[PDB]
């Protein structure tokens, strides 16, 4: 039984679903695969900022948003919302140490809580070194940024296409593929964990 997670690091609703990914990774016997879809492959300014989701995500999921994000990053004209570098960091963390899910959660915290520029290589290398990957992560990240990332995006978008999935977050359970009702479980990680346990029982 495999849980496929189609995500994008710059998708606010994926951050709202971060507790669901964390809860899923605690279910014994359940395999979890990450699929980055490449949502933004935008400079920060008038167009990118026009946020009203974010406070709604916080109301629904309890996920925190930091002042350095609201009043720092989203106000920084020279920041770029690029989904490719953070996705390559997730790929590299998974390739090096099987820490893809942990790296995605850390990336989202760096962006939404800390207001860091997750599209920049030094920030992603700093996050990898925080997770204890400083030996080899730089080379793995640069390697994953090229043709591995491109192939990963193409694979993810073909999966989205076959499932009729319009966007992120999207969870699909493979036993045969079944897309799950993620909106039902937003803000309910304990319900979500029990649902995945109940699927193993059935
Ligand atoms: S965060 C990027 C967008 N995600 C959603 O709109 C999800 C909606 C919530 N899950 C919900 O309504 O409960 C997105 O993917 N938009 C379409 C796109 O492909 O850009």
How would you explain this protein's 3D organization?
The longest helix has 16 residues. The chain is built from 12 helices and 4 strands; from the N terminus they run E-H-H-E-H-H-H-H-H-H-H-H-E-E-H-H. It is α+β, with helices and mostly antiparallel strands and 202 residues long. It is 55% helix and 10% strand. The site of glutathione has 9 residues, from helix 1. It is classed as oxidoreductase. Keywords: Dsb, DsbM, disulfide reductase, thioredoxin superfamlily, oxidoreductase.
What percent of residues are in strands? 5-15%
Task: Give the overall shape, derived from the CA principal axes.
Answer: globular
Distance between the termini: 12 Å
What is the N-to-C succession of helices and strands? EHHEHHHHHHHHEEHH
Q: What do we call the CATH topology?
A: Glutaredoxin
- When the domains are counted, the total is 1
Which class best fits the helix and strand makeup? alpha+beta
Instruction: Report the top-level CATH class.
Output: Alpha Beta
Main beta-sheet strand count, sense and barrel state: 4 strands, mixed
Total number of helices = 12
CATH architecture: 3-Layer(aba) Sandwich
Strands, count: 4
Helix content: 55-70%
Task: Enumerate the strands of the largest sheet in spatial order, edge to edge or round the barrel.
Answer: 2-1-3-4
**Ligands bound to this protein structure:** glutathione
Radius of gyration: 16 Å
The CATH superfamily name is Glutaredoxin
Binding site for glutathione: 11, 13, 168
Disulfide bonds: 11-14
Organism: Pseudomonas aeruginosa (strain ATCC 15692 / DSM 22644 / CIP 104116 / JCM 14847 / LMG 12228 / 1C / PRS 101 / PAO1)
Domain DSBA-like thioredoxin: 7-178
């Amino acid at each position: 039984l495999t849980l496929h997670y189609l995500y994008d690091p710059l998708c606010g609703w994926c951050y709202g679903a971060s507790p669901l990914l964390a809860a899923a990774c605690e279910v014994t016997g359940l395999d979890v695969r990450l699929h980055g879809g490449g949502m933004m492959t935008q400079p920060v300014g008038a167009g990118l900022r026009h946020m009203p989701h974010d406070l709604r995500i916080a109301q629904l999921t309890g996920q925190p948003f930091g002042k350095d994000y609201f009043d720092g990053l989203l106000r920084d004209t020279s920041a770029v919302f690029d989904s490719a570098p953070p996705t390559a960091a997730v790929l590299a963390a998974e390739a090096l140490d099987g820490l893809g899910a942990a790296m995605l959660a850390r990336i989202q915290r760096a962006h939404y809580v800390e207001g860091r520029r997750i599209a920049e290589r030094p920030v992603l290398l700093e996050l990898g070194a925080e997770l204890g990957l400083g030996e080899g992560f730089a080379e793995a990240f640069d390697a994953c940024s090229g043709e591995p990332l491109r192939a990963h995006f193409a694979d993810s978008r073909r999966l989205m296409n076959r499932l009729g999935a319009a966007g992120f977050p999207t969870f699909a359970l493979e036993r045969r593929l079944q897309v799950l009702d993620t909106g039902r479980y937003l803000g309910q990680p304990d319900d979500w964990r029990a649902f995945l346990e109940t699927q193993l029982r059935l």
